[PDB]
Amino acid sequence: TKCTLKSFTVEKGIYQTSNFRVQPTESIVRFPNITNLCPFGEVFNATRFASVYAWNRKRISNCVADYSVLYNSASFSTFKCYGVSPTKLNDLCFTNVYADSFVIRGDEVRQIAPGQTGNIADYNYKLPDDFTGCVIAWNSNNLDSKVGGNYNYLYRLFRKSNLKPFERDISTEIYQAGSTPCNGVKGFNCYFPLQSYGFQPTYGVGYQPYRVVVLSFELLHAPATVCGPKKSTNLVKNKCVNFNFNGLTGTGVLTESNKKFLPFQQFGRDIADTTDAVRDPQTLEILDITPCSFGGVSVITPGTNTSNQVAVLYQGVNCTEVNVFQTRAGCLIGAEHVNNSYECDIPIGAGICASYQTSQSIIAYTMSLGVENSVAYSNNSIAIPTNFTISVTTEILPVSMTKTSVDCTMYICG
Amino acid sequence: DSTECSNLLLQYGSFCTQLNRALTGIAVEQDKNTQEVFAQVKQIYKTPPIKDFGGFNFSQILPDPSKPSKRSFIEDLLFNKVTFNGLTVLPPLLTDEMIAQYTSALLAGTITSGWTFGAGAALQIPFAMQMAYRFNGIGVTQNVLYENQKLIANQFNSAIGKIQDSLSSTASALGKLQDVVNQNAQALNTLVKQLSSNFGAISSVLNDILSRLDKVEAEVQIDRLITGRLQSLQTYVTQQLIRAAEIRASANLAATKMSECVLGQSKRVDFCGKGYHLMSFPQSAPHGVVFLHVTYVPAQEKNFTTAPAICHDGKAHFPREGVFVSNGTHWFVTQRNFYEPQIITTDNTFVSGNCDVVIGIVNNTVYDP
Amino acid sequence: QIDRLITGRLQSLQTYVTQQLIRAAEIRASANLAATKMSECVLGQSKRVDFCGKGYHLMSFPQSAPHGVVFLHVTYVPAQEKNFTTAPAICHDGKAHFP
Amino acid sequence: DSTECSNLLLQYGSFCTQLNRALTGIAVEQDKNTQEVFAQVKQIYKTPP
Amino acid sequence: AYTNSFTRGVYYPDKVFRSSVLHSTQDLFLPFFSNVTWFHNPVLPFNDGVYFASTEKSNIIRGWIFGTTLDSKTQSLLIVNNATNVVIKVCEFQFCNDPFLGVNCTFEYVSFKNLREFVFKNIDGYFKIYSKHTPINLVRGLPQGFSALEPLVDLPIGINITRFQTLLAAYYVGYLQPRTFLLKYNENGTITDAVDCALDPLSE
Numbered sequence A: 001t002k003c004t005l006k007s008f009t010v011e012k013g014i015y016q017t018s019n020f021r022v023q024p025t026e027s028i029v030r031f032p033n034i035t036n037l038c039p040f041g042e043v044f045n046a047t048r049f050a051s052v053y054a055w056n057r058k059r060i061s062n063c064v065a066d067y068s069v070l071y072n073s074a075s076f077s078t079f080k081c082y083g084v085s086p087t088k089l090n091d092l093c094f095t096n097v098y099a100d101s102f103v104i105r106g107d108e109v110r111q112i113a114p115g116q117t118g119n120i121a122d123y124n125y126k127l128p129d130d131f132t133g134c135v136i137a138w139n140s141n142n143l144d145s146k147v148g149g150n151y152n153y154l155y156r157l158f159r160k161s162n163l164k165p166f167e168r169d170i171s172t173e174i175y176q177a178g179s180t181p182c183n184g185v186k187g188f189n190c191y192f193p194l195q196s197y198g199f200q201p202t203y204g205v206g207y208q209p210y211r212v213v214v215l216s217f218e219l220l221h222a223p224a225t226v227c228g229p230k231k232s233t234n235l236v237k238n239k240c241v242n243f244n245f246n247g248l249t250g251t252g253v254l255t256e257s258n259k260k261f262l263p264f265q266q267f268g269r270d271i272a273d274t275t276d277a278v279r280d281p282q283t284l285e286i287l288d289i290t291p292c293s294f295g296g297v298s299v300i301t302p303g304t305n306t307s308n309q310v311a312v313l314y315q316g317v318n319c320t321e322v323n324v325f326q327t328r329a330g331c332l333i334g335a336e337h338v339n340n341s342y343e344c345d346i347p348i349g350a351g352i353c354a355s356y357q358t359s360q361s362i363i364a365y366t367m368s369l370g371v372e373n374s375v376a377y378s379n380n381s382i383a384i385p386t387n388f389t390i391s392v393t394t395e396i397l398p399v400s401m402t403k404t405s406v407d408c409t410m411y412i413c414g
Numbered sequence B: 001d002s003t004e005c006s007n008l009l010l011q012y013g014s015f016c017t018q019l020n021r022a023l024t025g026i027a028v029e030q031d032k033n034t035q036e037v038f039a040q041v042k043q044i045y046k047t048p049p050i051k052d053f054g055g056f057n058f059s060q061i062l063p064d065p066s067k068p069s070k071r072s073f074i075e076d077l078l079f080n081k082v083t084f085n086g087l088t089v090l091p092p093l094l095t096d097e098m099i100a101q102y103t104s105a106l107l108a109g110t111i112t113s114g115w116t117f118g119a120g121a122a123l124q125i126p127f128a129m130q131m132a133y134r135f136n137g138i139g140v141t142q143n144v145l146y147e148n149q150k151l152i153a154n155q156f157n158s159a160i161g162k163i164q165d166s167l168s169s170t171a172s173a174l175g176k177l178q179d180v181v182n183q184n185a186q187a188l189n190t191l192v193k194q195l196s197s198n199f200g201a202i203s204s205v206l207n208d209i210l211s212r213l214d215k216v217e218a219e220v221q222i223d224r225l226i227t228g229r230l231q232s233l234q235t236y237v238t239q240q241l242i243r244a245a246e247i248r249a250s251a252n253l254a255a256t257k258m259s260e261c262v263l264g265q266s267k268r269v270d271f272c273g274k275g276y277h278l279m280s281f282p283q284s285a286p287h288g289v290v291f292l293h294v295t296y297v298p299a300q301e302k303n304f305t306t307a308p309a310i311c312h313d314g315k316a317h318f319p320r321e322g323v324f325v326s327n328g329t330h331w332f333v334t335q336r337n338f339y340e341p342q343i344i345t346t347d348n349t350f351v352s353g354n355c356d357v358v359i360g361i362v363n364n365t366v367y368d369p
Numbered sequence C: 001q002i003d004r005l006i007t008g009r010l011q012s013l014q015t016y017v018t019q020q021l022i023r024a025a026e027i028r029a030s031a032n033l034a035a036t037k038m039s040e041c042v043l044g045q046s047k048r049v050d051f052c053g054k055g056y057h058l059m060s061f062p063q064s065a066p067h068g069v070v071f072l073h074v075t076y077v078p079a080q081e082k083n084f085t086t087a088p089a090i091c092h093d094g095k096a097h098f099p
Numbered sequence D: 001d002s003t004e005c006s007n008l009l010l011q012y013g014s015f016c017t018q019l020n021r022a023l024t025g026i027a028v029e030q031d032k033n034t035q036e037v038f039a040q041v042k043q044i045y046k047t048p049p
Numbered sequence E: 001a002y003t004n005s006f007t008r009g010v011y012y013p014d015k016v017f018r019s020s021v022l023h024s025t026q027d028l029f030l031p032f033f034s035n036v037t038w039f040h041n042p043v044l045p046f047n048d049g050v051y052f053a054s055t056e057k058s059n060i061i062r063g064w065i066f067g068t069t070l071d072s073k074t075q076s077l078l079i080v081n082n083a084t085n086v087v088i089k090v091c092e093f094q095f096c097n098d099p100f101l102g103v104n105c106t107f108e109y110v111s112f113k114n115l116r117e118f119v120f121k122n123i124d125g126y127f128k129i130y131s132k133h134t135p136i137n138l139v140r141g142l143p144q145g146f147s148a149l150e151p152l153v154d155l156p157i158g159i160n161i162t163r164f165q166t167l168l169a170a171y172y173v174g175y176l177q178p179r180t181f182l183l184k185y186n187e188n189g190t191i192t193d194a195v196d197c198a199l200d201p202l203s204e
């Protein structure tokens, strides 16, 4: 109070000093039910992957993509991300993603990074230097390597110019390795542009085959349809909390409600836009939002020249949430209730007043309206005064403010 | 309570403090008004069980002791007819049940005790004699009331019945009080509605801005919203200051109407409503007060020939307490504001000089008792 | 930068002048009341119940004060009393009398 | 009459609404003051000749 | 062939419950008492947004197409109820130019006595379909009794739409305009009446 009034002395009365507001005890978060996972079993446990010149492509869209299972997938001999952290991906959103995927010798994984050179990058699938996305690979010798050699796995060794970023090129047309006219048939100076790894079980751990996926991320003019999977909490009731429902952030005492929403409706508004109720997105109860308990704090006091005992009103706040006494004005604290209901020394509210009284303490009570009088009226009778008194009564009225003037240019601009 | 805004609000210093002092000023004025109208009495008078009030049937305007909170019947009609970010709606200092005690006590004094319960200790007086004094107040000789006491009581009870029907059959009499609540509900709803407005900012959802942007961009956007919300509050509080000064002008008028029109018989023409004033009763209503003024209104009249004096022994005579009138055949003296003819006499008149000065004087016999 | 300071200062000064105007409107009303109290309670005797002090007003004396006026109202208050039997009229022989 | 300006003025919300409204409040009260002073008498008493 | 809309074509403007309030908003609406085209056909412009309705007790009216061309050159909506449910696709299509019976591709999805109606608009890139099915007993013209259309789907597909046509018992088409409106909710959060603020001075 002293700190509020900018004074070391305070006169008898009541002063509002501050705001009381129950804290958000924890956070509740809710999202749509566990649904619509992207088809990544068909991207990492699938039976085969392509010859890299004709690398597999699939549109990923309209689904949540869990990257946590992928960064947890310890069987990945390679798992890397560029432009972004792998841990951040379960928060991100994109229009599309693509599962750009194939087989290569493990040695050429050196080329499978942003902006790199070499046969696979330059002639099969060009990674740009700006690549915002991830590379994944794992050894596949037990599937893709074969006795006498698996020749079915092909890569473009020869091309006249490099591929553009994430371009694809099937073209089997004969690489004319000189002035010799090849006319699209194999021979001297006329090589198949595609060449075979011929994977044999004798190959060293890098020369062996690896299955590969590159995750091409894409945000465009069309809204996001690939997102990292959101996480719902348990839902506490009847206690003040921070909350979110989908995108509807708020804070309050969430409760059950009687409200009969139409099935498509997600949340309510009150008389003047304020969000008053919500559908839960995982089991479709309608919850009320009710305001988190708040009100002014006021200090009730005798004159500081007279005592330093003080009492506090929490304006309109019920005592349950905060000596202690309940009132229609809110909870009163430090004061002592009494039945004997005197005139007001200090006003509180709702008929309640407080005073400093006898070892003296702040008492609080319903106020007197003055002494009662049953007048002895009867149409038979009158009273007439036998004696009288002059009285003198002070009355005080202000007539002038202090005549004040300001040079607005001096006040504003010095 | 979103912390980035809570930091940035400290840029503006005193504004977001001094509005609570301004609104505290408004708050105290409400209980100051309510006190200065209703607390104009030192003791809570209460009425005896009897109803010997000369047939005046005050049962409708007195408290019903069975009523859930002790309103009169007519106070209950009035109570029935009159009809969350950062908001607080404080209690009045006095409850509706307390106001009913004040409107009881004032009325109990006004019924039992003349004006005296305003001017000193309340002195009991028979109610017919109080009306007889109030008739004397408007210039009618007190016998005229007593000689019509039953008829006046029957008129008064009829008028009270017509008040009940007037108040019940249309709300349009209470328009002022409903208007005052409507203005406040309108102002608060618009003050709340302005939170949805955008003020040249990217959004009016505060935490949305914090989610979309660079900290620096968000500070610009949030300073816009602070600027808008601030100007909204300064607008609203400006309205509430002006409105409270208006309602306090009404309160000082009401406080005057209590002291002059209930506790007395303030003669001021067309202060206590239409007609010559007799008395008035307060009744409490939500946020306000309702006066039942009781007033004498003349209603049937006749023409007479008149002379400003009469001449007798060559001395001019003037009417002592009234005016001279005739139907051509004789002359009578009468009281100014009600027909009550009397014989012209030396004591019903006074002498002033010889007749020859007075324009329109007439020759007639003064009977000398 | 200074355009922000000008904006802030100017908005504050407009707020201040608005406060002084509304306050001055009260003090004008208070002056009209006081001037009336002078004209009625000092230059005469107001019959208006409890306008000049409490109880029946005799007169009042103004006394000067900082920024205002103090009235000393002088009033008559009846202070001791008796009950009596009373009647609205007295009948003499046949005829009614009133005081 | 600029549409480009008007759109921005609508983003500031109910200020423009309530400023027309408050001045209408002032304006109606001028007729009310005039009836409160002059229209006290319901019959037009013509002058005697 | 003109006819008139009277009171038709109002829909829940957002997913919001409102408790018996006389709420108001500005959105694309069919203007009250505006004209509409009537039919038992050409390709049609989409303009700002399309209202469609029919007395379709039989579901022989069966589909719609939308886009800029609404054919081949860009990803374009095909919609057909296959009598199991509403089917949607968005290909740069080369399908039949007039499907009837005698008596790159990028996405797909699956959901007189009576009247059936829809309202189509795209905002930001998201595409809305509002809908209604109701009993009626009316012979011809649109029913002047009041009712509201309700959302089916809200699709992220992002396509530019400027033309459309219907595939296949009386039917009607009208166009939306940006209008301020009043909407009467009840104690159950259904819309139950509305006002076009630009219609007339009483409406204002």
Ligand SMILES: *[C@@H]1O[C@H](CO)[C@@H](O)[C@H](O)[C@H]1NC(C)=O
Pocket (backbone or CB within 6 Å): A040, A041, A044, A045
């Ligand atoms: C793939 O196989 C592993 C075991 O090799 C299994 O744990 C996992 O659940 C399977 N599915 C996916 C989508 O990873």
Ligand SMILES: *[C@@H]1O[C@H](CO)[C@@H](O)[C@H](O)[C@H]1NC(C)=O
Pocket (backbone or CB within 6 Å): A033, A034, A281, A282, A283, A284
């Ligand atoms: C959400 O999934 C859980 C577990 O499968 C199930 O109990 C619940 O009923 C589902 N709720 C909805 C609305 O899908």
Ligand SMILES: *[C@@H]1O[C@H](CO)[C@@H](O)[C@H](O)[C@H]1NC(C)=O
Pocket (backbone or CB within 6 Å): A318, A319, A320
């Ligand atoms: C006070 O608060 C508790 C907890 O909400 C509640 O049980 C009690 O009924 C409240 N009393 C009043 C009068 O609000």
Ligand SMILES: *[C@@H]1O[C@H](CO)[C@@H](O)[C@H](O)[C@H]1NC(C)=O
Pocket (backbone or CB within 6 Å): A378, A379, A380, A381, B050, B052
């Ligand atoms: C009222 O006055 C009448 C006539 O003077 C008398 O009979 C009656 O007893 C009186 N009652 C009271 C309570 O004064």
Ligand SMILES: *[C@@H]1O[C@H](CO)[C@@H](O)[C@H](O)[C@H]1NC(C)=O
Pocket (backbone or CB within 6 Å): A386, A387, A388
């Ligand atoms: C009237 O009251 C005063 C009080 O001082 C007293 O002195 C005086 O004697 C009283 N007179 C009568 C007649 O009672």
Ligand SMILES: *[C@@H]1O[C@H](CO)[C@@H](O)[C@H](O)[C@H]1NC(C)=O
Pocket (backbone or CB within 6 Å): B301, B302, B303
């Ligand atoms: C009074 O006399 C005038 C003039 O003779 C006449 O107009 C009027 O009707 C008469 N009666 C009353 C009650 O005014």
Ligand SMILES: *[C@@H]1O[C@H](CO)[C@@H](O)[C@H](O)[C@H]1NC(C)=O
Pocket (backbone or CB within 6 Å): B325, B326, B327, B328, B329, B330, B331, B332
């Ligand atoms: C009124 O007329 C009647 C009948 O002529 C007469 O008795 C009475 O005295 C007249 N009064 C006056 C004052 O003219």
Ligand SMILES: *[C@@H]1O[C@H](CO)[C@@H](O)[C@H](O)[C@H]1NC(C)=O
Pocket (backbone or CB within 6 Å): B359, B360
């Ligand atoms: C009254 O009016 C008549 C009109 O002829 C006039 O002669 C007479 O002198 C007037 N009387 C008085 C008293 O003014």
Ligand SMILES: *[C@@H]1O[C@H](CO)[C@@H](O)[C@H](O)[C@H]1NC(C)=O
Pocket (backbone or CB within 6 Å): B361, B362, B363
């Ligand atoms: C009154 O009486 C006197 C008697 O001398 C007479 O001269 C005069 O004309 C009379 N006047 C009137 C107005 O009757």
Ligand SMILES: *[C@@H]1O[C@H](CO)[C@@H](O)[C@H](O)[C@H]1NC(C)=O
Pocket (backbone or CB within 6 Å): A376, A383, C081, C082, C083
């Ligand atoms: C008047 O008489 C009644 C009945 O005896 C009594 O109750 C009352 O106190 C008396 N009042 C005074 C002022 O003497």
Ligand SMILES: *[C@@H]1O[C@H](CO)[C@@H](O)[C@H](O)[C@H]1NC(C)=O
Pocket (backbone or CB within 6 Å): E002, E003, E004, E035
């Ligand atoms: C509207 O339709 C009517 C017939 O329904 C037609 O006469 C009129 O030209 C159309 N256009 C306008 C603007 O009314």
Ligand SMILES: *[C@@H]1O[C@H](CO)[C@@H](O)[C@H](O)[C@H]1NC(C)=O
Pocket (backbone or CB within 6 Å): A260, E186, E187, E188
């Ligand atoms: C409103 O809801 C109640 C409870 O579900 C239902 O009985 C009633 O028919 C509904 N009324 C309307 C007008 O929808």
